Design an enzyme around this catalytic site. Sequence first.
Site, PDB file in Angstrom:
ATOM      1  N   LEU A  43       0.658  -1.165  -0.176  1.00 23.83           N
ATOM      2  CA  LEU A  43       0.065  -0.043  -0.177  1.00 23.83           C
ATOM      3  C   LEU A  43       0.594   1.018   0.164  1.00 23.83           C
ATOM      4  O   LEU A  43       0.002   2.477  -0.603  1.00 23.83           O
ATOM      5  CB  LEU A  43      -1.170  -0.321   1.190  1.00 23.83           C
ATOM      6  N   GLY A  44       2.233   1.216   0.366  1.00 21.53           N
ATOM      7  CA  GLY A  44       2.852   2.444   0.571  1.00 21.53           C
ATOM      8  C   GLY A  44       3.843   2.605   1.573  1.00 21.53           C
ATOM      9  O   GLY A  44       4.165   0.850   2.794  1.00 21.53           O
ATOM     10  N   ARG A  45       4.403   3.216   2.027  1.00 15.70           N
ATOM     11  CA  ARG A  45       5.168   3.055   3.073  1.00 15.70           C
ATOM     12  C   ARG A  45       4.996   4.542   3.859  1.00 15.70           C
ATOM     13  O   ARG A  45       4.285   5.551   2.978  1.00 15.70           O
ATOM     14  CB  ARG A  45       6.876   3.929   2.449  1.00 15.70           C
ATOM     15  N   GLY A  46       5.539   4.622   5.531  1.00 18.99           N
ATOM     16  CA  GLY A  46       5.760   5.271   6.236  1.00 18.99           C
ATOM     17  C   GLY A  46       6.800   5.858   6.601  1.00 18.99           C
ATOM     18  O   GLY A  46       8.180   5.673   5.353  1.00 18.99           O
ATOM     19  N   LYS A  47       6.587   6.547   7.794  1.00 17.52           N
ATOM     20  CA  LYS A  47       7.892   6.852   7.781  1.00 17.52           C
ATOM     21  C   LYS A  47       9.143   5.889   8.161  1.00 17.52           C
ATOM     22  O   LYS A  47      10.591   6.202   8.374  1.00 17.52           O
ATOM     23  CB  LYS A  47       8.368   8.104   9.359  1.00 17.52           C
ATOM     24  N   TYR A  48       8.602   5.585   9.377  1.00 19.23           N
ATOM     25  CA  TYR A  48       9.361   3.810  10.158  1.00 19.23           C
ATOM     26  C   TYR A  48       8.899   2.351   9.872  1.00 19.23           C
ATOM     27  O   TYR A  48       8.680   1.614  10.781  1.00 19.23           O
ATOM     28  CB  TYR A  48       9.676   3.783  11.542  1.00 19.23           C
ATOM     29  N   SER A  49       7.850   2.638   8.606  1.00 19.68           N
ATOM     30  CA  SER A  49       6.632   1.149   8.246  1.00 19.68           C
ATOM     31  C   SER A  49       6.917   1.163   7.125  1.00 19.68           C
ATOM     32  O   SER A  49       6.586   2.558   6.480  1.00 19.68           O
ATOM     33  CB  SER A  49       6.001   1.136   8.917  1.00 19.68           C
ATOM     34  N   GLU A  50       6.809   0.375   6.027  1.00 18.03           N
ATOM     35  CA  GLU A  50       6.043  -0.837   4.934  1.00 18.03           C
ATOM     36  C   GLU A  50       4.472  -0.736   5.252  1.00 18.03           C
ATOM     37  O   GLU A  50       4.277  -1.930   5.680  1.00 18.03           O
ATOM     38  CB  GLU A  50       6.186  -1.084   4.105  1.00 18.03           C
ATOM     39  N   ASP A 151      -0.678  13.850  15.618  1.00 13.76           N
ATOM     40  CA  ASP A 151      -0.445  14.168  13.933  1.00 13.76           C
ATOM     41  C   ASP A 151      -1.442  13.825  12.934  1.00 13.76           C
ATOM     42  O   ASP A 151      -2.168  12.942  11.544  1.00 13.76           O
ATOM     43  CB  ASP A 151       0.753  12.456  14.204  1.00 13.76           C
TER      44      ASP A 151
HETATM   45  C1  QB8 Z   1      -0.652   1.662   9.297  1.00 16.52           C
HETATM   46  C2  QB8 Z   1      -0.789   3.080   9.577  1.00 16.52           C
HETATM   47  O1  QB8 Z   1      -0.575   3.562  10.554  1.00 16.52           O
HETATM   48  N1  QB8 Z   1       0.663   4.247   8.450  1.00 16.52           N
HETATM   49  C3  QB8 Z   1       0.097   4.101   7.844  1.00 16.52           C
HETATM   50  C4  QB8 Z   1       0.716   4.356   6.471  1.00 16.52           C
HETATM   51  C5  QB8 Z   1       0.984   4.462   5.276  1.00 16.52           C
HETATM   52  C6  QB8 Z   1      -0.398   4.183   5.215  1.00 16.52           C
HETATM   53  C7  QB8 Z   1      -0.930   3.470   3.094  1.00 16.52           C
HETATM   54  C8  QB8 Z   1      -1.857   3.003   3.296  1.00 16.52           C
HETATM   55  N2  QB8 Z   1      -2.498   2.719   4.591  1.00 16.52           N
HETATM   56  C9  QB8 Z   1      -3.595   2.156   4.614  1.00 16.52           C
HETATM   57  C10 QB8 Z   1      -4.537   2.185   4.284  1.00 16.52           C
HETATM   58  C11 QB8 Z   1      -5.687   1.743   4.119  1.00 16.52           C
HETATM   59  N3  QB8 Z   1      -6.715   1.306   3.069  1.00 16.52           N
HETATM   60  C12 QB8 Z   1      -6.819   1.310   2.092  1.00 16.52           C
HETATM   61  C13 QB8 Z   1      -7.360   1.286   1.145  1.00 16.52           C
HETATM   62  C14 QB8 Z   1      -6.315   1.909   1.407  1.00 16.52           C
HETATM   63  N4  QB8 Z   1      -6.006   1.605   5.638  1.00 16.52           N
HETATM   64  N5  QB8 Z   1      -7.391   0.878   6.474  1.00 16.52           N
HETATM   65  C15 QB8 Z   1      -7.016   1.070   7.254  1.00 16.52           C
HETATM   66  C16 QB8 Z   1      -5.806   1.113   8.050  1.00 16.52           C
HETATM   67  C17 QB8 Z   1      -4.501   1.316   8.787  1.00 16.52           C
HETATM   68  N6  QB8 Z   1      -4.775   1.524  10.053  1.00 16.52           N
HETATM   69  C18 QB8 Z   1      -4.250   2.026   6.689  1.00 16.52           C
HETATM   70  N7  QB8 Z   1      -3.794   2.377   6.454  1.00 16.52           N
HETATM   71  C19 QB8 Z   1      -0.969   3.497   5.494  1.00 16.52           C
HETATM   72  C20 QB8 Z   1      -1.368   2.974   6.970  1.00 16.52           C
END
Ligand code: QB8
Length: 326
Positions: A43-50, A151
Amino acid sequence: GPVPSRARVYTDVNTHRPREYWDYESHVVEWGNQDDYQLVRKLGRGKYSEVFEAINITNNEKVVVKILKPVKKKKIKREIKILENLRGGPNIITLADIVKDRTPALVFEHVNNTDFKQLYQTLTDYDIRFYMYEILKALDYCHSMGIMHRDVKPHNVMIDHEHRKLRLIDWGLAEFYHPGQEYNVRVASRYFKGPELLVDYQMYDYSLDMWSLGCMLASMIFRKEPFFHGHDNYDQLVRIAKVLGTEDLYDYIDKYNIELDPRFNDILGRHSRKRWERFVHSENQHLVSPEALDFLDKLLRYDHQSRLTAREAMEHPYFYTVVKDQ
Ligand SMILES: CC(=O)Nc1ccc2ccn(-c3cc(NC4CC4)n4ncc(C#N)c4n3)c2c1
């Protein structure tokens, strides 16, 4: 030195809890079984996670997995403890599981999120009021539970628009509020940083989240993303000052005896407080009302103590139709 500050509301919520509620350094992580999940796609990258979409093979649930890059044990424990404390709260993301294999991965409830760059441009006046109210329910809850998000921003608000479903996500920067504590000001995305962060006032509280929320509301009603578009952290305060005015900024600095970086001296200048009307045009006027502007004015304040609480915001006339409909 700087004058101290206390939250107006929920000031001592943690002091009354058992130690274990907030003492996250002592928390022992409950590990689930990694083999219960199979990753489907990135789904993508964060600062400290994928972040991945996955399937729980045990029950055929779609979930989201945040695989942590290296972060200190206590920072992971903090996010876990906060998610556990808040679980079941209104519009709070559910942490479903915690797995390892030696990297830790957090497993969340999946929200079928509508594209933030697309969805926002379809929202009606009612939609903005409705979703703002839903975010306020999450913020009042977490604040009442002794937690600052720190945040709040569009990326961290998942909206499944078809189902009118909203979740506040990414509690990786959240912290427990304890009166007197000097917090790290190096938090939040540039455009959403409160004045307290930008002037290095460390004794901040829940009210930080209300500034961030005001930034979101402004960008939505005015169709201006980001609303305060700084070049860096210094210029960010300048952009705020060109709207809120410099008189109120310097009043805030004086009240708290804040030592302003000498750098700022040459760059803040002198700015009038602007009326909101300069941000209204033919494209956005259908989103903009007296109510919206009154509500926005009372979130976007330098002085953290003067901003609406989440609970006060929920009582604003902006929401009267929404409240009746629910
Ligand atoms: C998990 C977190 O704290 N970091 C984060 C960082 C980057 C991304 C990129 C996508 N997500 C998503 C995308 C979707 N849903 C799908 C349709 C796109 N969701 N649905 C529920 C979460 C949560 N928690 C979520 N996270 C990120 C979450």
